[PDB]
Amino acid sequence: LKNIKVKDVMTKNVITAKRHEGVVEAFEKMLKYKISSLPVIDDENKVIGIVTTTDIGYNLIRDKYTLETTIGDVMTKDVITIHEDASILEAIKKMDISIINQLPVVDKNNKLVGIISDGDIIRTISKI
Amino acid sequence: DTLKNIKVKDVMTKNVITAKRHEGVVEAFEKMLKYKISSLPVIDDENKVIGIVTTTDIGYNLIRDKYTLETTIGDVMTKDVITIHEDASILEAIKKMDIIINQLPVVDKNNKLVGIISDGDIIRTISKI
């Protein structure tokens, strides 16, 4: 697993959200497309947070959101991310900090390049 | 300890919530969100696994208006459901998971549901090495 880097297994041109948009509409888009998380980015394409269907879903069904409420209101501030050149064992360790099902992947300059998941890692460990 | 040394029993989640075949698809979706779960094993009155539904797939079908008021779990569930025996190794879990399913229902000597092993639980085991 040493010779496998996050970039070889991550998912690439991923759908993202901006801080300004409605969290409910995002949840719906997520449902419609079978997406499980939305990294959130600024205009510079840096990663600023992440929302997931699991978490949005959990508060939504608790009536805690409105049609006005934005992604920016509800995203977690201390978003765990991983670098593209990191090894899979590294990804595994970073995920086991709570688990977390997905890390946003960033490049040299912390510009989003992809997402690594649960599944990607299982899919890879399967290959060996 | 290695992926071959470790029994599915040792790492699975127990006490899992389930769904009966006649439960409404909509209330089960709502239940799934309330409790942060992503797949409901569907069981019969004897705790035998008769299917599975996921949040991803229910959500997808609701938001696309594919289900009426009368749509039950039994109308929509995946039928030919893959389970793993609790005595098996994590490696067998892994393999059964690649052959886009995040979770396996786990059954005992007699195909009664004892728990669920997820991609998460496997990640948390591998991390220990």
Curated annotation (Swiss-Prot), chain A:
Residue ranges of domain CBS in the record: 10-66, 75-128
UniProt-listed InterPro entries: CBS_dom (IPR000644), CBS_dom_sf (IPR046342), CBS_domain-containing (IPR051462)
CDD domains: CBS_pair_Euryarchaeota (cd17784)
Keywords: CBS domain, Repeat
Superkingdom of source: Archaea
A Pfam family reported for this protein in Swiss-Prot or TrEMBL: CBS
Stretch forming the signal peptide: none
Transmembrane regions listed in the UniProt entry: none
Classification via SUPFAM superfamilies: CBS-domain pair
Protein name from the UniProt record: Uncharacterized protein MJ0922
Species: Methanocaldococcus jannaschii (strain ATCC 43067 / DSM 2661 / JAL-1 / JCM 10045 / NBRC 100440)
Highest classification ranks of the organism: Archaea, Methanobacteriati, Methanobacteriota, Methanomada group, Methanococci
